[PDB]
Write a protein that binds this ligand. Structure first.
Ligand SMILES: CCCCCCCCCCCCCCCCCCCC(=O)O[C@H](COC(=O)CCCCCCCCCCCCCC)COP(=O)(O)OCCN
Ligand SMILES: CC(C)[C@@H](C)/C=C\[C@@H](C)[C@H]1CC[C@H]2C3=CC=C4C[C@@H](O)CC[C@]4(C)[C@H]3CC[C@]12C
Ligand SMILES: CC(C)[C@@H](C)/C=C\[C@@H](C)[C@H]1CC[C@H]2C3=CC=C4C[C@@H](O)CC[C@]4(C)[C@H]3CC[C@]12C
Ligand SMILES: *[C@@H]1O[C@H](CO)[C@@H](O[C@@H]2O[C@H](CO)[C@@H](O)[C@H](O)[C@H]2NC(C)=O)[C@H](O)[C@H]1NC(C)=O
Ligand SMILES: *[C@@H]1O[C@H](CO)[C@@H](O[C@@H]2O[C@H](CO)[C@@H](O)[C@H](O)[C@H]2NC(C)=O)[C@H](O)[C@H]1NC(C)=O
Ligand SMILES: *[C@@H]1O[C@H](CO)[C@@H](O[C@@H]2O[C@H](CO)[C@@H](O)[C@H](O)[C@H]2NC(C)=O)[C@H](O)[C@H]1NC(C)=O
Ligand SMILES: *[C@@H]1O[C@H](CO)[C@@H](O[C@@H]2O[C@H](CO)[C@@H](O)[C@H](O)[C@H]2NC(C)=O)[C@H](O)[C@H]1NC(C)=O
Length: 1101
């Protein structure tokens, strides 16, 4: 055939490889000999079997073979890439029709006085080259963790750049002895020179499959798109749905513009009758025996009061009061703790120079003198320094101190060039390895990657000691940083492990609790003052003592069962019971007071029973409504607020019993002792005149409800940390510092359980660096989630490292004494030990990889490798990432990490990313564990839950009210207004700035309970009226507001207003945001609906 190159004619110059000898195209080389053909087929491939007029010689082919092994090990990972290299070079020399696409631009005279090619030109197009570049575009150099394109192609980004390096003449570097140029353009209208072409193989090519890490095409691009989770259009989807609903409703209204209860009442009527008889029975006993009942109450308080002091008055800690012990995210933590040890105990310290760079020699000199002090010679009260508690990657290794000081091995740098040294270490961490041999990324050590201009740098200390000794040192560290003096202009914010626990139980704001009672006491006397003008001080005091006695009795009774109340939640209860407890006091006394001027025939004792009997149903409903709502709220599994419901349910039942059996007896004596003479409009006539505009009132409020109904989807989620801890604390500074001066997120450990990892089938679902690994393997899937999910850090796959550790290429990694299975000790420097796997036994397609028993035999060697000579030694990094018993690997951990997570919207989102991915592997028995997952487990289903609980409460009210009221058309109206209030509160919940948590969920669940109190009294009076009042609706509602309106304004509304008004002045910001705003807004809204909407609504019921 036409050969443009055949044979060699000596070296161009001294110490130079022999160059090819140019020959004319017409010249016909001799047919390939048997000896030559044998080498060509094996070196290049089977395609050269049939070639006859090959343009190569024995010395020419071997020369190419010698140089191929220079690069073959560097691209052997991708079989497709390897094939292309061989074909390009093999056809570049031995192609039969070489002259078709090969031209010799220039020639030179060799030392042997023989012409030798100096410049070579080859004709192709940008199709073979373009595909060839694509195949090796993404190949990764595992050893350096960088692209092999950097070395082989000089980091070429385009095919021209890559092939330019290949065609460059670098004989000294082993490159092409003579310059080679590529001619992509080839017109050849005369059909003289034909273009270069052959069979290309991409990474995805089935025959020559390639791993995902070496090419994206073979990687699981089949990612099911996830979307439609936020909204549609510029507004929430729900809002649009409701808005269109109104429009269609208006159209129906526009179209129309042109134009048994009594059967069951028999049992229900008798049901209330039996209720009155029983209640009247209690009244007579409690009034006729004001000593046997009063005395036992005092004694009962002592028994419960003593129990609190003696048996238990304890509290809890964050993990025991914000995460349920039955949730999956907690049962998974216990598994992780038992096997892979509890997570470390961080001590992050931030050094901040807001408004300027922080890194200066005086600052660096100052810090180095205190970082060493903390981690070397601090010592707790028991003399246990950091070195006795630090985290050591192995038996012997310097303590892990993730700080920028470790770049200099902990020694002060010289002032002459300290700036330059740090920049180089930060840019290339591997060079400046710390004392414990672990590179420190600049993101984990500075606020940004510029370092020099960084505003703050982080200093993380890790403790692997989980005994009480570690707690004492942390207390010493906290007391050492608070009293530490910093240079002018800086600022230190830190957080030990015990800081949060110590700071939640530190806002002893009990002072405000006393004031609220005292403020309520002042009002209580005024509210209960005799209509004549006399003030009954004893009744007001007796009312408060009953409330306090209920809490004391409730705590004692529940202390026996072992419940513990947190300090933060133990301060709300006094406010809550005061708000609701005193509410019944005014009614019972007010009804008796009304009976003072009427029915004068009855004596003091007789009148009392009448008041109790008359109000028996109204009060009882306020109890069943104030007890069912709390019990409903107990369905929240967070122990801090689950105990809040239970501690409040018993603090109202006991109060209810006390107010019916104890307080009445006090009234039996105080009134009897007084024996007052028989007791015989402004700002009121104006009322009931504004209510004449019934139709207008409904329109305004109905518009308010519908408007508030579209803003619900804007309610935020999450409980901010800075609220929980007291203000003016050292944790609020830290939390504001993590959200701004941190660049590394929490780690996530993708635990895997009950996997053989000794069978080729199972090993293929984890590996992600070998061609035959399953596409949907763990390493492969997580690789793609990096660009789509919150888990965006490289996976520390131990299995991949274990296999590569056996690579015969790395002779220093796996070594065995010849003829024996004993691992060759590192001391032996001679060639008395061979690699564990022979050259022909280790292939990238996992051909002869360890299997069955062999897998565990070599796992012991890898896990115990020194790691010093071979960087892939797994002892240091994966010492505690495996759980094995020399027969199988019980469990393993693949570490990853999220991105900084600069808010509570990221914390919730990050949690679902760890739960979604862990559910994408139906075969693997896997779960993802990050330290913060347990705390954010409620937000996964808080949306559906807050509708079931609040929705279930409203249905409950419609049922108990229906029985007690006996009038369905009235109970439904009551439920329609309570649900109206909640939706309005839900909208204002978003506007004000409150979030939806377990704390806010229970507050909103008990809002219906409070909301029913305002409205139930009006409905009850309206439903049942004296014969004198007209049976028409308009007069009946007017009558009710004139008989019970006064009590509602004073007893029901103003009482709660004073109870919660003082709660605004609270040291802890959690009380103000969640307990005050929610309850203060409820009173305003409920006081409007109950007193302006419910009257108007009932008029035209
Ligand atoms: C006669 C007695 C029996 C009557 C029948 C039962 C009545 C039950 C009424 C329940 C009222 C619930 C009020 C909840 C207020 C707080 C809501 C907080 C936010 C919330 O639930 O989630 C957002 C919106 O939810 C949503 O889906 C928003 C819609 C919530 C319901 C809207 C009001 C329902 C009707 C009220 C009147 C009933 C009259 C009864 C006479 C989520 O937002 P996202 O979708 O972006 O988040 C997707 C991720 N989770
Ligand atoms: C510096 C090296 C390590 C970089 C470039 C990577 C791979 C090297 C080994 C590759 C890249 C291009 C290759 C190359 C270019 C061209 C020729 C001319 C041909 O007639 C014989 C093979 C030969 C001589 C090979 C030898 C191996 C080379 C030089
Ligand atoms: C009912 C009260 C006692 C609750 C709301 C107050 C505080 C505790 C129980 C809870 C509420 C929110 C929790 C919380 C919020 C967010 C974070 C950030 C995360 O990276 C670590 C856990 C951490 C730091 C935890 C710690 C425990 C907290 C602060
Ligand atoms: C914090 O950063 C500033 C910014 O350079 C350091 O220097 C100050 O720079 C501002 C702005 O030029 C000047 O107004 C101050 O007078 C500088 N103060 C100095 C030089 O002490 C500052 O030193 C840094 N704080 C430290 C190192 O503690
Ligand atoms: C955590 O640190 C403590 C304190 O050093 C260790 O407790 C010591 O254990 C040794 C056992 O040889 C005793 O001799 C000491 O008296 C203990 N000291 C104290 C203060 O109790 C504990 O062993 C460490 N735990 C771990 C898991 O390393
Ligand atoms: C993985 O690749 C190796 C290497 O090719 C295969 O083992 C044999 O390799 C020799 C030399 O290349 C071939 O002549 C043999 O034909 C190969 N064996 C077979 C069965 O073809 C090994 O087979 C490959 N394994 C898989 C699963 O493809
Ligand atoms: C080593 O530990 C593993 C734990 O992963 C044991 O796993 C066995 O797994 C099989 C298959 O699921 C079960 O039928 C066995 O009951 C498991 N063993 C036990 C003890 O539960 C494995 O058996 C252990 N082997 C040795 C020699 O201890």
């Amino acid at each position: 055939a036409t050969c443009a190159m055949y044979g060699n004619c000596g070296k161009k110059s001294v110490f130079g490889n022999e160059l090819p000898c140019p020959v004319p195209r017409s010249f016909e080389p001799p047919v390939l000999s048997d000896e030559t053909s044998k080498l060509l087929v094996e070196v290049c491939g089977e395609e050269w079997k049939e070639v006859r007029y090959a343009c190569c010689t024995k010395d020419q082919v071997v020369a190419l073979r010698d140089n191929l092994q220079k690069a073959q090990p560097l691209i052997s990972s991708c079989p497709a890439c390897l094939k292309n290299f061989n074909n390009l070079f093999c056809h570049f020399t031995c192609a039969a029709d070489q002259g078709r696409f090969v031209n010799i631009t220039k020639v030179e005279k060799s030392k042997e006085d023989k012409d030798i090619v100096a410049e070579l030109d080859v004709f192709m197009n940008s199709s073979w080259a373009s595909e060839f570049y694509d195949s090796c575009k993404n190949i990764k150099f595992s050893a350096t963790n960088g692209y092999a394109m950097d070395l082989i192609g000089g980091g070429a980004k385009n095919y021209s750049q890559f092939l330019k390096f290949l065609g460059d003449a670098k004989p000294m570097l082993g490159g092409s002895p003579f310059q080679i140029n590529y001619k992509y353009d080839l017109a050849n209208e005369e059909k003289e020179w034909q273009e270069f072409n052959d069979e290309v193989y991409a990474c995805d090519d089935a025959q020559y499959k390639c791993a995902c890490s070496d090419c994206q095409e073979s990687c699981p691009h089949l990612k099911p798109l996830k979307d439609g989770v936020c909204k549609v259009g510029p507004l929430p989807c729900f809002s649009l749905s409701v808005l269109i609903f109104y429009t269609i409703c208006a159209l129906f209204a526009f179209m129309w513009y042109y134009l048994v209860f009594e059967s069951f009442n028999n049992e229900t009527n008798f049901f209330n009758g039996k209720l009155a008889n029983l209640f009247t029975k209690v009244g007579q006993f409690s009034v006729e025996n004001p000593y046997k009942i009063l005395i036992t109450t005092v004694f009962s308080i002592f028994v419960f009061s003593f129990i609190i002091f003696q048996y238990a008055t304890l509290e809890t800690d964050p993990i025991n009061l914000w995460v349920s012990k039955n949730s999956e995210k907690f049962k998974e933590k216990e598994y992780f703790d038992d096997n892979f040890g509890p997570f470390y105990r961080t001590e992050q310290i931030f050094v901040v120079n807001e408004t300027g760079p922080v890194l200066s020699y005086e600052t660096l000199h100052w810090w180095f003198d205190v970082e060493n002090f903390i981690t070397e010679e601090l010592q707790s009260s028991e003399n246990i320094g950091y070195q006795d508690l630090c985290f050591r990657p192995t038996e012997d290794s310097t303590c892990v101190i993730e700080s920028f000081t470790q770049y200099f091995q902990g020694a002060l740098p010289n002032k002459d060039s300290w700036k330059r040294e740090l920049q180089e270490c930060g840019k290339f961490p591997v060079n400046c390895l710390p004392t414990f041999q672990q590179p420190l990324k600049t993101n984990l050590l500075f606020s940004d990657d510029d370092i020099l201009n960084a505003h703050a740098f982080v200093v993380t200390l890790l403790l692997t000691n989980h005994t009480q000794s570690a707690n004492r040192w942390e207390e010493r560290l906290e007391e050492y940083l608070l009293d530490l003096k910093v240079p002018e202009g800086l600022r230190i914010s830190f957080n030990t492990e015990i800081s949060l626990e110590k700071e939640l139980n530190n806002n002893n704001d009990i002072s405000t609790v006393a004031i609220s009672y005292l403020m309520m006491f002042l009002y209580a006397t005024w509210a209960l003052r005799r209509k004549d003008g006399k003030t009954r001080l004893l009744l007001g005091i007796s009312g408060l003592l009953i409330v306090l006695a209920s809490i004391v009795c409730a705590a004692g009774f529940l202390t026996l069962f072992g419940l513990k109340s947190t300090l933060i939640i133990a301060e709300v209860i006094p406010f809550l019971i005061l708000a609701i407890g005193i509410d019944n006091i005014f009614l019972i006394t007010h009804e008796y007071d009304r009976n003072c001027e009427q029915k004068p025939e009855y004596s003091i004792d007789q009148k009392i029973i009448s008041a109790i009997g008359r109000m028996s149903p109204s009060i009882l409903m306020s109890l069943l409504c104030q007890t069912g709502c709390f019990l409903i709220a107990a369905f929240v599994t967070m122990p801090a607020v689950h105990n809040f419901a239970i501690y409040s349910t018993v603090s109202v039942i006991f109060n209810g019993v006390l107010q019916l059996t104890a307080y009445v007896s006090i009234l039996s004596l105080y009134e009897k002792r007084s024996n007052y003479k028989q007791i015989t409009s402004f700002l009121k006539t104006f009322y009931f005149k504004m209510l004449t505009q019934k139709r207008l009132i409904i329109i305004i409020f109905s518009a308010w409800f519908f408007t508030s109904l579209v803003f619900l989807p804007e309610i935020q989620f999450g409980l901010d940390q800075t609220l929980a801890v007291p203000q003016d604390s050292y944790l609020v500074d830290y939390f504001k510092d993590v959200y701004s001066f941190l660049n590394v997120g929490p780690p996530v450990y993708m635990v895997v359980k009950n996997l053989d990892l000794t069978k080729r089938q199972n090993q293929q679902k984890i590996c992600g660096k070998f061609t035959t690994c399953e596409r949907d393997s763990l390493a492969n899937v997580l690789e793609q989630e990096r660009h789509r999910s919150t888990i965006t850090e490289p996976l520390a796959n131990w299995l991949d490292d274990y296999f590569m550790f056996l690579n015969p290429q790395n002779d220093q990694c796996c070594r065995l004494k010849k003829g024996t299975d004993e691992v060759c000790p590192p001391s032996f420097p001679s060639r008395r030990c061979e690699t564990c796997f022979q050259q022909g036994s280790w292939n990238y397609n996992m051909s002869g990889f360890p299997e069955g028993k062999d897998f565990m035999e070599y796992l012991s060697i890898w896990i115990n490798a020194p790691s010093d000579p071979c960087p892939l030694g797994g002892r240091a990094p994966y010492s505690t990432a495996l759980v094995y018993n020399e027969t199988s690997v019980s469990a393993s951990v693949f570490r990853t990490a999220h991105h900084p997570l600069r808010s509570q919207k990221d914390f919730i989102q990050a949690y679902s990313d760890g739960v979604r991915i862990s559910s994408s592997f139906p075969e693997l028995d896997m779960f993802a564990y990050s330290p913060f997952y347990i705390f954010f487990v409620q937000y996964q289903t808080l949306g559906p839950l807050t509708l079931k609980l609040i929705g279930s409460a409203i249905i409950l009210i419609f049922f108990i009210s229906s029985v007690f009221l006996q009038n369905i058309r009235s109970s439904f109206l009551l439920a329609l207004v309570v649900t109206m209030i909640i939706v309005d509160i839900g909208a204002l919940m978003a506007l004000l700035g409150i979030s939806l948590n377990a704390v806010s969920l229970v507050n909103l669940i008990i809002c219906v309970g409070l909301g029913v109190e305002f409205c139930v009294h009006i409905v009850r009076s309206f439903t049942v009226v004296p014969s004198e009042t007209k049976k028409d609706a308009n007069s009946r509602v007017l009558y009710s507001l004139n008989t019970i309106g006064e009590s509602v304004i004073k007893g029901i509304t103003l009482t709660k207003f004073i109870g919660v008004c003082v709660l605004a002045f609270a040291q802890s910001k959690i009380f103000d945001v969640f307990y005050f705003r929610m309850w203060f807004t409820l009173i305003i809204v409920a006081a409007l609906h109950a007193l302006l909407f419910l009257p108007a609504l009932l008029s035209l019921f």
